[PDB]
Design a protein around this ligand. Structure first.
Ligand code: HEM
Length: 153
């Protein structure tokens, strides 16, 4: 469970994400695909993007980066009372996209990496620790929904 102080560390950095949602979302998806290329294979919509330059040049990918961060932000804003927000996501990721928890670990690592790269004087150990706790909670709760839905994850 996160404390109020930890949620305030998480939402203070989220405000920074909000100053450029498309840029952070684009950077996160490209870092995910660069670091874990097998995750691209889960996206029939984007597997044509066979180089990093092609990914950067894709407005459709950038649009999806915004969709992704918007959903994550809506979850984080609920501080752990996020059950309604999480439900459709766990549903689609379990039953349609079939995204294992390990790949949610990979994207959580990409989020942290990008927050560090974009925010050098502004994303320190306490903030990163708290963001890692919020993303762990996110993954924990998704995994509980995966199990109710019968999906190994
Ligand atoms: C922070 C984690 C994530 C969030 C918040 C997120 C959010 C979303 C949202 C809001 C959508 C559109 C609505 C839906 O279908 O549910 C979506 C679609 C999708 N997601 Fe995720 N996602 C996450 C992680 C991942 C990961 C790690 C993968 C794959 C390795 C993935 C694969 C997909 C696929 C395949 C689609 C459908 C894209 C399309 O063809 O339009 N998601 N995601």
């Amino acid at each position: 469970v996160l404390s109020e102080g930890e949620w305030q560390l998480v939402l203070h950095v989220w405000a920074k994400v909000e100053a450029d949602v498309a840029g952070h979302g684009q950077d996160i998806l490209i870092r995910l695909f660069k670091s874990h290329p097998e995750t691209l294979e889960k996206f029939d919509r984007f597997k044509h993007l066979k180089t990093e330059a092609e990914m950067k040049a894709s407005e459709d990918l950038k649009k999806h980066g915004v969709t992704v961060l918007t959903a994550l932000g809506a979850i984080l804003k609920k501080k752990g009372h996020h059950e309604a927000e999480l439900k459709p996501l766990a549903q689609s990721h379990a039953t349609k996209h079939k995204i294992p928890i390990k790949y949610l670990e990979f994207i959580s690592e990409a989020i942290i990496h990008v927050l560090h790269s974009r925010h050098p004087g502004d994303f320190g150990a306490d903030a990163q620790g708290a963001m890692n706790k919020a993303l762990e909670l996110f993954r924990k709760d998704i995994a509980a929904k995966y199990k109710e839905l019968g999906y190994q994850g």
